Design an enzyme around this catalytic site. Structure first.
Site, short mmCIF file in Angstrom:
data_model
loop_
_atom_site.label_atom_id
_atom_site.label_comp_id
_atom_site.label_asym_id
_atom_site.label_seq_id
_atom_site.Cartn_x
_atom_site.Cartn_y
_atom_site.Cartn_z
N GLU A 1 -10.23 -3.15 -5.66
CA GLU A 1 -8.84 -2.81 -5.42
C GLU A 1 -7.94 -4.40 -4.56
OE1 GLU A 1 -6.58 -2.47 -7.90
OE2 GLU A 1 -7.59 -0.12 -9.09
N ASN B 1 1.00 -8.83 -13.35
CA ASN B 1 0.17 -8.47 -14.13
C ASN B 1 0.86 -9.13 -14.98
OD1 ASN B 1 0.37 -5.61 -12.28
ND2 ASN B 1 -1.83 -6.46 -12.59
N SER C 1 5.05 -6.85 -14.21
CA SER C 1 5.07 -5.83 -13.15
C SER C 1 4.25 -6.65 -11.87
CB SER C 1 4.05 -4.23 -12.94
OG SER C 1 2.79 -4.43 -14.08
N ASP D 1 -1.03 13.16 -11.95
CA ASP D 1 -0.49 12.27 -13.02
C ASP D 1 -0.66 12.41 -14.85
OD1 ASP D 1 2.16 10.75 -14.38
OD2 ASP D 1 0.59 9.37 -14.82
#
Ligand code: NA
Length: 129
Positions: free
Chosen positions: A35, A46, A50, A101
């Site tokens: 990452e 992005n 975002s 999540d």
């Protein structure tokens, strides 16, 4: 801050990521490597407008407020700049919400494409933990 592999593994372990929702430390270190290359200051915009922030590239659409992602949520109740700190506490705490999540570490595209189904414990090899 650009962490060392073992320096980051230690900080992740201390903050309770080791075996968090079933994911060994090597899964977290591999993710951070692909990452951000272990850089707390990493940012990546992005196409949806975002931005991804910090060592685990947490997205402004859902997880943090950066003041420029329209109709976004702030589920970690933090400004995205907090995810860029040399102290990874906010990044780690927010990552715990993300991985809880529903989709696990699949929430991290670089983990799914570059770590998942690999010998991840390689990433802590030689580390005093
Ligand atoms: Na947001």
């Amino acid at each position: 801050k650009v962490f060392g592999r073992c320096e980051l593994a230690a900080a992740m372990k201390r903050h309770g990521l080791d075996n968090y929702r079933g994911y060994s430390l090597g899964n977290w270190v591999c993710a951070a490597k692909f990452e951000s290359n272990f850089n707390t200051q990493a940012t990546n915009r992005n196409t949806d407008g975002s931005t991804d922030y910090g060592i685990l590239q947490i997205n402004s659409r859902w997880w943090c407020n950066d003041g420029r992602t329209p109709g976004s949520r702030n589920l970690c109740n933090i400004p995205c700049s907090a995810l860029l700190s040399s102290d990874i506490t906010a990044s780690v705490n927010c990552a715990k919400k993300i991985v809880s999540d529903g989709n696990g570490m699949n929430a991290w595209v670089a983990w799914r494409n570059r770590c998942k189904g690999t010998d991840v414990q390689a990433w802590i090899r030689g580390c005093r933990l």
